[PDB]
Every structure is written in structure tokens, then in C-alpha cells.
């Protein structure tokens, strides 16, 4: 069979059904946020029922909106076309009528910037709230009455099939030649990123220290946020006039990262744990990652590789 979400209003006078909480972007398109609402004609003297989709943002504080969309009980006289396969089965199962929202391409994804412990308000980020309501006037000051708020997510995960290798070259001045590369285009949360490091130091001075980091890039446009999610400060030295090779390994995980106020996480529904933000393949938050190889000489040198931190396309179900 299957399972769905069925939040209803505080006074029994309205109910929202959703098939799921997450919607996915195949890059050039976006899934429709599609559901049905049960309506009560016997309460509904106001004579109109409407549903809202809102791509909000939260950041004293600012609450913005990046996208707002609305849809028509009594049934629309002509807009019967976009009824989705999911909705028709609730229609069969139940006085309930569709609501649907095709978020346009080139809009941000479900990103929860951290709820830093020092703050207690609603979490920052691009939260998708679907808000079904009954009203007499679409301009009325919406009270806590028969409306039902429900947060959703719109997300992106692993780009299937093989892709280009994050090979890189950088040299400084004889040459201090630095090369690094990974083994895959895409990589996954919490797994080891295989960091290769070739160095040829024709200078007199020693490479004092080597840092590998994996760094989180999240562009905020309501600016961009930069923070290292992982780091390996190996002691290996490229001795003067030598050829060097080493393979490093790092794993980025949230566990240590919780204290770094302002990181970005995959969209929280309520307060449940999620992975660090899957990369975005535009307003809002656009998030991507790189593996960084740095050499410290007794005076730094570095190379920085395009790293796609993501999650496999989950075939079984969404997170939770």
C-alpha cells in the first residue's frame, strides 16, 4: 500500500492531506506540491475555501517570502487538468478537492540553517509551508481558525551515472608543483573522501604541515556562507628537493559540527536531526562543497577541487 500525512485544523472544519513531505528537482523541472483538502459546506457560510503554498525564508529577525501561490471550493469551473495521480486516490478514499503548486525552476531548496543554541525562535532558512484556510475575504487578517499549517521540503540528491574527475593542478615559484584528485565526481555524507596529494618541492624550504579540509559552500540571497565540515591536519612533510605522494582520507559528519553556529542542514520539519545540506545542482540558499588540499611551508599553498557532497537518490523513502 502506502502512507500519507493527514493534518487537520484546530476545530475540525478543515483538513489537509499530503502524500509526502519532500519534493525533488530533476534539475530542469520540479515536482508539484499536490494535495487535497476536505471541506465542510455546513460550516462554510463564508462560501470560499483556498489553499496556499509559500516558499518562505527566515533570517531582531526578518521573515521574507520568496514565492507565494494560491488555488481555488467551490470547484474551479475549468482548471481540472493538473490533478495528479496521488490526489485522485485520496478523492477515491473520501467533499475533498485538489490543491497543487508547481514551484518554478530556479528556486532554492529545503535548507535549514542551524538553530544555534543562543536563539529560541523558529529556525532560519527556506521552509515550505502549505496553509489551507477558509475565509470570506482573501484580504482578511487570518486568525487561528480552520486553517492548518503544514511544512514541506523540496530537495535534490545524487546525480546518477559517472562524471568528470576533480583533478586539479597548481604550481608556484623553480616550481613547487602541487596536484590532487579524488576518485568520484559525487560523494556521500559521512563517507571517506579519498584525497590524493602529489607534491614536487624543488625549493629549499620544508613543507611544515598539510591540511585537508572539506568545506561547505552555501550562497544566501534573500551573500555566501563558508565553513569547514571536516579537517585532517596530517604532519607529513615534503622535504626539500623531493617527490612526494600520499593518500589522505576525511569524513564530514554533523556530530562535531553542531557547535558551529550558522551552518546549513537539510530541511528540518520540526527539530529532527538531518545530514549536512545536500548540494544544489537563484534566490535563497544554493549549497555546494569542495575538497581543499593545503600545504604549509616554513607561505601557504593550496588547491581546491569541485566536490559534490550529496546523498544517494533514496529509493525506499525520505529521511523521516
Amino acid at each position, epitope marked *: 500500500g502506502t*502512507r500519507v500525512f493527514k493534518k487537520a485544523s484546530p476545530n475540525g472544519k478543515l483538513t489537509v492531506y499530503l502524500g509526502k513531505r519532500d519534493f525533488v528537482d530533476h534539475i530542469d523541472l520540479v515536482e508539484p506540491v499536490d494535495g487535497v483538502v476536505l471541506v465542510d459546506p455546513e460550516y462554510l457560510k463564508e462560501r470560499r475555501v483556498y489553499v496556499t503554498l509559500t516558499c518562505a525564508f527566515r533570517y531582531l529577525t526578518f521573515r521574507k517570502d520568496l514565492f507565494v501561490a494560491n488555488v481555488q471550493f467551490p470547484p474551479a469551473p475549468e482548471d481540472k487538468k493538473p490533478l495528479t495521480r496521488l490526489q485522485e486516490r485520496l478523492i477515491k478514499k473520501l467533499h475533498a478537492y485538489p490543491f497543487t503548486f508547481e514551484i518554478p525552476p530556479n528556486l532554492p531548496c529545503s535548507v535549514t540553517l542551524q538553530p544555534g543554541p543562543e536563539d529560541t525562535g523558529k529556525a532560519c532558512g527556506v521552509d515550505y509551508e502549505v496553509k489551507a484556510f477558509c475565509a470570506e475575504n482573501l484580504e482578511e487578517k487570518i486568525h487561528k481558525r480552520n486553517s492548518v499549517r503544514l511544512v514541506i521540503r523540496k530537495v535534490q540528491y545524487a546525480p546518477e551515472r559517472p562524471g568528470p574527475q576533480p583533478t586539479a593542478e597548481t604550481t608556484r615559484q623553480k616550481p613547487l608543483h602541487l596536484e590532487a584528485s579524488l576518485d568520484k565526481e559525487i560523494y*556521500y*555524507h*559521512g*563517507e*571517506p573522501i579519498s584525497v590524493n596529494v602529489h607534491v614536487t618541492n624543488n625549493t629549499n624550504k620544508t613543507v611544515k604541515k598539510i591540511k585537508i579540509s572539506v568545506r561547505q559552500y552555501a550562497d544566501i540571497c534573500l551573500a555566501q556562507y563558508k565553513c569547514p565540515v571536516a579537517m585532517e591536519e596530517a604532519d607529513d612533510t615534503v622535504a626539500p628537493s623531493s617527490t612526494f605522494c600520499k593518500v589522505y582520507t576525511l*569524513t564530514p*559528519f*554533523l*556530530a*562535531n559540527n*553542531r557547535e558551529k553556529r550558522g551552518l546549513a542542514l537539510d530541511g528540518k520539519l520540526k527539530h529532527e*536531526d538531518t*545530514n549536512l545540506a545536500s548540494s544544489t545542482l537563484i534566490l535563497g540558499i544554493i549549497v555546494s562543497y569542495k575538497v581543499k588540499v593545503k600545504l604549509v611551508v616554513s607561505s601557504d599553498v593550496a588547491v581546491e577541487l569541485p566536490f559534490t557532497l550529496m*546523498h544517494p537518490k*533514496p529509493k*525506499e*523513502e525520505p*529521511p*523521516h
Partner: antibody
Amino acid sequence: VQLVESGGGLVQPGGSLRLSCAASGFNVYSSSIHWVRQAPGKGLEWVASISSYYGTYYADSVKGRFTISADTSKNTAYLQMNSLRAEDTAVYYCARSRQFWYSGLDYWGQGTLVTV
Amino acid sequence: DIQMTQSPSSLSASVGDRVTITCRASQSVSSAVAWYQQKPGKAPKLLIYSASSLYSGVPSRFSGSRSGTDFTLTISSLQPEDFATYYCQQYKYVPVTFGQGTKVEI
């Protein structure tokens, strides 16, 4: 891909143990490691779980006595034991599960016998 | 402590039998249920997850099911290699109580 644990043996009650669980083919931070015991002729009892990605859970029937940890650089867990008792006598296992997302315990080690 | 009430404690299931396990929790755990198979003395092994999905490495004869907060692992047809002790397991709440186990013998 494998799990193998060691450290089972005889101890009189009041003793301690340090079971270990090496594995290959997967890494701890992508996975959650567990211990479970099948006491003589009886069924499985959850004892402890470590969710590597997030920073540890272990049951009331073991609480304050059994403790789970892992050493990451060598892809291994532990199950430190204090104030063991007679009922603790069980053959102990180690287990791994997909952390993202927790989909039940996928692989188990061959089993090690502990008697108190 | 969700009393993850699994039964029967043992079952004779001749080859070809429709082995079926009921399993009632004392509390709602949504769909977060796994199942495992233990061959005498060694590693248990997961058969079903998300209370429905079959794990990679598991013969398709194993099947997850659900109705309310009853969970039920099922084998379409029990082969000679199946016999072991199987365990329901809910994994929404801590403790993650396994069922006391249904042992199967010829």
C-alpha cells in the same frame, strides 16, 4: 564487507570485559554500530547502539553497566562492561546499519561467547 | 519500554509452509520496523526494513507487511535453508526492543 568481534570468555561475576568489533567494507561514520546478545537458549536483546554521524544508546537492563564506543581510524567498536552479573551470560554480537537512513541492522559478526 | 509483543515463541514449518509472524507493539511506532534471522549461535541477519522493504542480500520470498501497529514478517514459501530464529524489531523508539524471537524447526 565483514564484521568480526572478539573478547568473549569466562569471568566470575563482578568482573569486566572489553569486547571489540572490527569491520571492513564500510566505515563507522556512514553507519551505526550495535551490540545484541542471545542468552543461552533465549532470544535477542538490544544492549547498545552507537550512531556515529551524530555523537550513544544502551538499554535499561544494561544501563550504567554496559557501554558502547568506537575507534574510527581502524573501523572498530567496543563494548566495555562493568559489574557483570550471572544473567549477563550470553553470546554477544556486533551490528551495522545504514546511518542515512537507519534501515535496520544489516551485517552481524560471527558471535563471541561470554559467561559469568 | 515498548513491549514489542511477538509470537509464537516457536513454530514447526515444514518446507513450503507459509511462515507468518504476528507482532504487536504496546504503542504506536509508525512504520519503523525491521526483521532479522539468526542461525544457531552466529550472526543475525536483516530480512526486512521500513517494515516493508527487503534488504540487499535477502531472498525475495521474505516480505514485510503492516496493518495499524501490528507488524508481520512473512515468507512466501519456507525452504530447507530458512530455519533459524527470527525477530521482529521496532526502530522508532528507544529501547529498540526486539521481539522475544520465533524459532522455527522442521
